[PDB]
């Protein structure tokens, strides 16, 4: 016989376990009507603008409960290292600064990703993408966020869009008369740690699957600001269907899934292997960015059906800028997920001063006296440059032009600033993944620059070779707390070169008491070699 | 100050360049009505069953023009190798056998993928997925197709579903009153060659991108039945958005895109780099499965916007079972893409006999006298076993049980048969990707079995090592032509062990004049080591 069985069978398909708050007066944009015997809902498209505006505004200032609980868990656990409690407190204190509705929680305000489920009898006019984008356009223009989207004029010529557009508008056709949503402010670092592996039947056994998890979790590293929300998907009907599942699973969108499969190949969570992923994360010693136990907040494992020959595997994380918001529109109005507004209640209840107001050769001498893992406090001037800045500088040296003088005077800060609020010295200004500028380290160091670099995440072995060769260093900043570094450490920000690039321009900043860890010294040591071998 | 710009702006968004055919009397399933001043369309949900039925039935017997043109181009091109013209003729002859509406073009009838775009005012009742699944359920139940889906009862315990369900129903919400579709019969092998790479700005330059394409195209190998439809996507708003684009790009779904970018980051095809991908494919010498020029039919390259920190890259192919069908439902009725029904017009106007009815050691002696690249014709008995059959045998040997004697008598054929037509000796019965059973070659050969293996695609270096140690061989069949091997070569099919596995049971077949190439000999030679180094 025939029996239809949906792949995803969530016992809470409308997310009732989430607390919502209705926008004041939002019932003027909806009207319940009846057509041909069926109840419909007439939605003013201006409601989609309001919803995307409020969603992509508040999500950069508040977090969910399960995200804040994980930070408190890293502080109150006796088994957490001193670095775990240090990073967890720095992020929680950063979460309190962001709650002021002025600074975003992280400088990477991220890509706007909208998963919309429009009912068959939910009528908006059809221009949902135009109206949702306008709400997103207001969120990033009129608030101290950052334009992070890069348009391609051809295959290689790029420019910023100036409005954090386009967005990923994944609008689906679902039954009913409502309009359910899921807004995601996916950061760049956590989006780059969405890995796709094509596997076989040989993987599907407890011995090989655990070894797979042990092997692949190390590839995440600390380049996406742990503690993570590790998501793992085994199987799938296609590569994109697996990567979409692991993306939503990282947002706890599929938590209501069953925990047992049937003869119809339904999706299900496997809590047994969720605990196994957490055991591998804790035993790894990678910890919260700088060694410890709390490498991950929690794990979600989903087992999907597969073809007899195919077995794709998805692995993705949610960074410390865990930014998702559930929402829906019905006859009552616009309801949007309520996020925790008082993060201070989750807060319970050894450093070395380094001044960069010297010749950089004198700063290099001081850093050489301390081993990897030493906590340092930078006080001086930094030169900020990232992906596009490094790419242009290399093209100058390939045309005979010299290495610019700003690359040699001060340490290099891999960072991209958000917009500065009125009356503030600097907007959110946190570090960026260092590993993306690894191919420029040896080249720039052999030309008398980039001796000291300040960023976030583990770097490749070629960088340690270049540092032990040219006598350089790599300082590892706490990745994540961009708001507290703006209101405390950074005192002055000035543009230096390439103002056409927006965030990715060359900046000169003056910092005070900037926390960082010595990750790579001039002797060939890497503080991540023990845990990320 | 605000301007909305969709990412994908195809100049032919309704696919007018495609030839459609109206189902007779299909206008009885639609009724055009007007509500609140806007014209809507009421669609009987039974129309989705009829549409999915005809789509997933006819697509397994006919191909598009550009796929058949690539085969003819591989025969008449002077620069095509003798093996290119041999494989291209074998596939063309297979398309004519499949055109008989009895045998499917390939034994892997694939996963049913449905991309539906339901209009805002297109009313079907909401149960679109239930009715679409029934149409797919009828296509694979009542036609000589194959149940290829594997349900997971838990994390490791698996069983077949018996109906090639579930499907991937990606139903989107689009403006209007129509219902546009794209049906895909995505095979397992080509779905496993959908690769995701997370890259950086360092890749975005002509020197690095060319080296990237050269390096990554070799990793595809021949395990997905070339000539390919190579699709490459640079950038994207997320990993799943990149992998979805490269799949649709492989189906020529985005051919109508512009060829230039703007300050708004719209998607566009880059024909310049499409020719560069074609130049890399032809100059690679990989050719149509066994060395030559036609490694790919054509290339599609799409440049997507990206975040300043993100740069995902998608690479996927469409195998020789290029199976996609466009369709839509409007006030006129049900329209479905017209595929070429007479493929013979595309066909323009010494082998080594090997007898397998001997001791397998005597067959090994004969094959040892010939080098790699020798084309052989198998005449005897083969033992058919695949992913789950190999997996169960290994767990038996891990419990102390011996390697079953049927693994030692005859060569092992990595294949999974489709359903047998009434009065036919065997349904479509082509080879599967060999590289997925590579971990069993050395183990099984040390127990006196699996000395000769017959499948498709290049294998890992551990297989070449195991052959020079245990004196084994690996014959590479022409991957793709499953229909012509059923009506000509295969004479009898009998189940031998593990009938619980359905398709993936252990089969004993008697073939006659089975074409194959000696890929790995007992001396450490690999005919793919030169092109896939
Ligand atoms: S810098 Fe860290 S917290 Fe911010 S978006 Fe990137 S990975 Fe997430
Ligand atoms: S066997 Fe070859 S042609 Fe058939 S589905 Fe697999 S890759 Fe495609």
UniProtKB/Swiss-Prot annotation, chains A, B:
One of its GO terms (molecular function) is metal ion binding. (S)-malate 1 binds at residues 107-108, 146, 189, 386, 432-436, 456. The keyword Iron-sulfur applies. It catalyses: (S)-malate = fumarate + H2O. Keywords: 4Fe-4S, Cytoplasm, Iron, Iron-sulfur, Lyase, Metal-binding. Its main location: cytoplasm. Specifically and competitively inhibited by 2-thiomalate, which coordinates with the catalytic [4Fe-4S] cluster. Weakly inhibited by malonate. It is an enzyme of class 4 (lyase). Binds 1 [4Fe-4S] cluster per subunit. Its EC number is 4.2.1.2. Pfam families: Fumerase, Fumerase_C. (S)-malate 2 binds at residues 192-198. GO terms for cellular component: ciliary plasm; cytoplasm; cytosol; glycosome. [4Fe-4S] cluster binds at residues 106, 225, 319. Optimum pH is 9. The keyword Nucleus does not apply. Cytosolic fumarate hydratase that catalyzes the reversible hydration of fumarate to (S)-malate. Homodimer. This is Fumarate hydratase 2.
